[PDB]
């Protein structure tokens, strides 16, 4: 299914995933279209910052959702 | 020279460079530092959007400067 | 009552709806104020994607709440 | 424990709160660390409006969770 | 020529222009295109909002160029 | 000379100035009028990033100019 993912400042993308992925494959499939380390990404819905063990069935994330990432700028 | 580089969720870190290092070098500095592909980095500075290829004196960057560091998220 | 439409930019806007509006009211609403074709938008609250068909109501949204609007770059 | 407060251009900050804390109690640390007046200030979770007497709890907002702020302007 | 009008979604719309076309000729451009109307178009280049009576090759937009286009609805 | 200061709520700022002023006397009025202090303010014209000790008059700043002022919370 399709969700989309902001950034702090607006900007979108769409990314594919199932419900029973848990938070950590979301990043894993972040990382594969975008090239950014799933330990460098906080994931956001409705306000909740999302468990990497926990799936996006857990959190009731249906399709055409929005998330939010935000970056953790640790070290390279 | 010691600049500075901001981020939306606050974490600022200072930069030691040369008015004629590259924008490329700046972002490499800045993935050793807080983990985020040069690809993905966008730096802006007295309006203007900081492109590869051009040195930190073309945009007048002097000590003491700013760089606002935004994710990209490219593509769609 | 009041309600407020929030862009990708942050630009924020105030609308005048009821509770038993629907969704593809709130964006005819839209195209009346501001010119958007209903076609071409996608209304979000607490991450969910709306349903043209469903109300305010439906979703739980109340007076001063906050709903999200991104362009559909075409989208029919 | 740890809330983020986000702003309409993405600039986001941490403040430390208890679930106790009243709204106005949240505005007010607001106040205490950034100046901004507590009469100037909307807070939101999940598109809701929150209002001042109810206390986070009440809301069920949680450790690590992200508020939106946006300012009560009067404009002439 | 053309050049490369970019959106918040991550949609790149390709625009045949001359340097001679105004602003206003590129908005019009994107009404037909996306729906969007001028009022509610605003257009960056070089860190300037770009006025819709200058011309691409007055603000130096050559071949190639990037735009950054946003949704600005107006109003309270 | 009127100057017209812009948010992002729609609440426009209507300032009776000098080109003489500086940027952190401008700040001051729009403290007087809406309670933002001025370290949290920021100001865009023409792209820039309006620094406080400078003048109107060194941005070119005229008669009915339009600034855009955006809240900026300090510190993560």
Redesign the interface.
């Known amino acids: 299914m399709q969700i989309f993912?902001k950034?702090?400042?607006?900007?979108?993308?769409?990314l594919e995933v199932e419900p029973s992925d848990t938070i950590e494959n979301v990043k894993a499939k972040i990382q594969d279209?975008?090239?950014?380390?799933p330990d460098?990404q906080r994931l956001?819905?409705?306000?909740?910052?999302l468990e990497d063990g926990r799936t996006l069935s857990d959190y009731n994330?249906?399709k055409?959702?929005?998330?939010?990432?935000?970056?953790?700028?640790?070290?390279?």
Chains 1, 2, 3, 4, 5, 6 share one sequence.
Not at 7 to 14: D, E, Q
Not at 64 to 76: A, D, I, N, Q, Y
Request: proline share 3%.
């Open positions: 993912v950034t702090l400042t607006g900007k979108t993308i769409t279209k975008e090239g950014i380390p460098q956001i819905f409705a306000g909740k910052q994330i249906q055409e959702s929005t998330l939010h990432l935000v970056l953790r700028l640790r070290g390279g």
